[PDB]
Amino acid sequence: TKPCWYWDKKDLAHTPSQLEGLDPATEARYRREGARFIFDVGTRLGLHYDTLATGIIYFHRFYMFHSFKQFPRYVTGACCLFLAGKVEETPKKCKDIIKTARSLLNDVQFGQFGDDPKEEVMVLERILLQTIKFDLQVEHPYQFLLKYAKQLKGDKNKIQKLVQMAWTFVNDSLCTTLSLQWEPEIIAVAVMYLAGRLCKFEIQEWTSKPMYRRWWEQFVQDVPVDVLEDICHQILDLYSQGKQQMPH
Amino acid sequence: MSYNYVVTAQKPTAVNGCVTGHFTSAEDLNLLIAKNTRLEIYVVTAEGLRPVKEVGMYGKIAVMELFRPKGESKDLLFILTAKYNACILEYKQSGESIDIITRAHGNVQDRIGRPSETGIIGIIDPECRMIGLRLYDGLFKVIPLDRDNKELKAFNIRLEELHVIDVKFLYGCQAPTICFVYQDPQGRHVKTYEVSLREKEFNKGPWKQENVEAEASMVIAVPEPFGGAIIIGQESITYHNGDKYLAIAPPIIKQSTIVCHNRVDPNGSRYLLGDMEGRLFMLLLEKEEQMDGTVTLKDLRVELLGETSIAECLTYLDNGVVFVGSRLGDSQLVKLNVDSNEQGSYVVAMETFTNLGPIVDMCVVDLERQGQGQLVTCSGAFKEGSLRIIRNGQKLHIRTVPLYESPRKICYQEVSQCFGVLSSRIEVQDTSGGTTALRPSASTQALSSSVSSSKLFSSSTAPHETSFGEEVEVHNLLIIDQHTFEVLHAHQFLQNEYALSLVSCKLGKDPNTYFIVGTAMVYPEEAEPKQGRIVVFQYSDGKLQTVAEKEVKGAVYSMVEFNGKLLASINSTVRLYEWTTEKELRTECNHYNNIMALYLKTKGDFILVGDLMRSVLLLAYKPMEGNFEEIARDFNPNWMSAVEILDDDNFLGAENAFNLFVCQKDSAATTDEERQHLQEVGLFHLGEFVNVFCHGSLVMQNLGETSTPTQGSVLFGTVNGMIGLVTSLSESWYNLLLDMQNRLNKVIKSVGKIEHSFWRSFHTERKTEPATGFIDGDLIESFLDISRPKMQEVVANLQYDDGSGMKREATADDLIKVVEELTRIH
Amino acid sequence: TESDWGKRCVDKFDIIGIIGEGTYGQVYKAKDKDTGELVALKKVRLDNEKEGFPITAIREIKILRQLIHRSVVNMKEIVTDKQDALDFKKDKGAFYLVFEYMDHDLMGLLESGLVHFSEDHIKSFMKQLMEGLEYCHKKNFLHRDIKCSNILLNNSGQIKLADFGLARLYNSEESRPYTNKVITLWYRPPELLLGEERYTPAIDVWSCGCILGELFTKKPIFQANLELAQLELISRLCGSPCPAVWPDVIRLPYFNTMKPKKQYRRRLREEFSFIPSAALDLLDHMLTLDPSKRCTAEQTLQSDFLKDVELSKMAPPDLPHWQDCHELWSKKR
């Protein structure tokens, strides 16, 4: 009925970009660059967190079917955000996305947009819709993170720190292929698991079953701890490369 | 941007209603006859009927009743139009000046309501205290007949019984009572209610409800000293009056449906009844004078007088003379005699008034190579079946050809000096197993005859078991001589086969001129027909030979000769057949995007398809590809009745709500979508039901270019026998005539003070739009019949522009010569 | 695979003809050349358009792939015009939204006055329309465009709700600023006429009330050319909007601007007295002025009129044809 939008870590070694001579580190760099571009363009435009995530998901899904060598990452990123606006009912004129794109990009970076920046983006919409197979409805970890945290009952301050920190990890997991590997319900639980381990919080105590150690099962059944640890490890590798450690 | 003119050539001849009273003066006995939009007034004389005045209304006459209120020296008339325009009129003559004063008027339409199945019913209280109108189901409107009620203000009383069959006001009651027959799940019943004007509501009826016959069709209020009511059914006539109850079921009445009644004697002793077979009976109420003094009703009796035309309404005048107002056939004045003639009949036909009746189909032909033309119509139904040859003369000459059976389609074959006419006769199921005809008709009385010997439908293994007395239609193709109108041949079709379409033409490279018929296998079980035939016949040496037959999976509603090929419509499909060198039809292409393709008209490679519900479509045969192509469609749901192509870009269509409309090709190449949209540009509430559109005219057209600048001519036949004409106008001609209409309305005093703009405004139960791109030719032609001072009032300060001529303020002689020019088109 | 959309070409459908002019493109009747099924195709032209693919087609795609119900139209797949030259820039094609083909729209049936609905036909129709609508409202979707031409009905007697081009999501938690100009004027509720922009799903219930009364009269109950004239019609029947019956009416913008001629009393039960008590009560509740006092889609399904209506007994609404009216005369008078 609906297409499958999930892959193994092993499969990512065979994306079109990879097999076109691009190495793994470079495709990962282009995915962070592209995601942070969509995020910063749409943040400047004053768009909802769901509209930004929807655009990033379309972007990540697109470079599963196409090569970064053949499709300039920033032109595709502008296109994703343009379509995501219409999908999430927060539309923005293409001229404004272009205007913001030139403001955030340098001269070399904006060269990708060619002579007619609007046309370059509009034209690509046909391929983007075909690539995403017209499966426009997208769910994000945010909604699930909020639904599960709402069901926790305990110290409002400690629960708030967990939610606030887990929200940040969702914003970082956007730069990664985690969206292409696990369902938002799994990612939402994984960021709660990560925020909890850093805060030294026993999340089971705030649930309807304070005696049930694997608390997450009452939100997502059939999710083994090792899957949560893999998602946690991948999120922490973003902080390990540079600074930002794991604050508060 | 469409500009058309529409004028009446023959007024509607069918009688819809007729009342008698003392309308012109207290002494004169009058007879008023309403023929759709027209109203005729006559004075009854010993010789017959003397005409005294005829008027037109801006509405279809639905109710018409005379009544004498308290204080009036003579009767006043009440009329209600189909568009709900109520009005009380008065006849007033001053020497020679005959006028119809509008004493009271107003529109009685309710904001919310469901129109009733049995139509509008209007009845007046014997004491003349109120006009009872049944417009909507579950509501009974009451206009109090008061001195101060000039606007005709009314209130609705809630009615418990939703489905009402008929209602009348009873005589001899202390309070104004209504008596009605209604229907519910438990069957049909008769009930009564008292109507309190003071309290504005119904009260308990004087007598109990009673369960009546399943087909109780009419209520008859009986005058004093009997009171109560008679209920006419299919098999029984019953009298109800509280405790009293009589019921007679004479076998004579069961064989045909009684359709109308009338009171002969004022006391209510004798009553005339008329049924679908024309048969006219007398229902006599046998009295029994009690010792009390009162006279109780002992028994009811029926007596067959004779045969008349299939009456819509009977109305006896005086003496043996009765006026038989017929809608299907010719109306009559018949003399009832106390002694039966040698045939056993007490009726003697005195005078016959022509009624072009339901004009189901027609064709324009030049029988004498004159260049004027003649219209041969398929008019009437049942024993009233006939052909009418109308020719211009200043009166129309009409020659009738009685067929004594229903005609369906006509067409002319010049090669054979004769017409082909499809016709249906009713035979009933007899004890022999087969069927038998009630009377002999055109098809049975043919010089030479044949029966289709096709084995296309074979055994059919179809359970069609039939009981006795059931009616069945028998379809035939009649071959009638173009000069004597003698039935040369009659070919009867297969059992349960209905002939729907007929064409005369040569096809392909075949030099013979064939008569092709399209049929449908009509079984009661089938919702829509699943089988049919396209039969090709050739008339030669006084006999029809079957040339070829092509089976189809549906009804063949319409056929047309299309560039040597045969274009036919089978249910939802529009097919184009080719005539092979093997004398056989072989399909070329199809178009299946239709609900039900009923009407076809072609102009070159274009085809105009009239659908059942999706209005009209413009198809085109692409010769290069050998298939059809949808040029543009009218996206307005319109239930059609007939279609016609005026020209390459303009297409006239007639609707079931008595409306006319014209669509034009958008002719704007900015997009492919707008090009495919047919825009309704002309709209006009005709007021008639158009069955057929036909290109031609009866006017003598000379060798050169003569007559009015109105180019084109399309005659049309209607259900009420009215014949009209449509023609196109130039832009300057239309704007001039449109301004004339506005000026004309401001001076012409209408009957019932009905707005002309309202009347011609396009109307269906859902939408009501103002008429556009259409000129009421009857309003324009009436300019000549007004006084000189009113003519000069109309022309005062009238400017025209962009007609290759200056401002020139039109004057009386300018418009009198232009209107006289427009009358010469019919 | 079946999940992969937009890849298959439109040439795999044999077009039968144009059936209507849609919101963003034409609608064609067509047959699948492989399976022989009949389908309806909505053309979505993006080449002549600015801001590419239209938001109206995006809404209809996003919402209909999420909604699956017997009384809501089915979008089967999406197909494209023949690709050419191998350059997507030069490609100025158009997509087509493939749908289930329906035999009619309520508009055409009522307009051509070719149908008659008994109490049992209205019961069957309304139970489907309300069941379909209740599914949408439970998924937090406003239709916002309910009208006769948007209620498809096939010969089976099945009803399907369609044209989700104006449909939007609704967030009950807190309030979202929407568009004031929604639904055609005849089926528009009073709150939108008086300027409400943060409205509820009760707007669709008003449209369905307008439809209910209309099935009993064969005519739209409120027909006016302008907002003020429309509010006058609604006021003549439902009563003038006033704080006595609608306390929050004073909060709307055009409350003082759009005042009816008089302070009318409610006459809905009086005027529609010819309707069976069960349906008259349903109509009375659906055409309630204050949207906070107007019934929900779920409540209409648990009403004396519809609750007991059997799901299995579809009762197809008889459309008389062929032998009907082609030659009426005294036999059919």
Ligand SMILES: CC[C@H](CO)Nc1nc(NCc2ccc(-c3ccccn3)cc2)c2ncn(C(C)C)c2n1
């Ligand atoms: C909303 C746009 C359109 C306007 O009428 N709605 C309409 N009608 C349909 N089918 C009922 C119908 C109506 C008219 C015709 C028709 C048939 C012949 C000529 C002209 N129109 C055929 C089917 C139909 N089927 C599937 N869909 C989906 C929405 C694509 C349909 N949408």
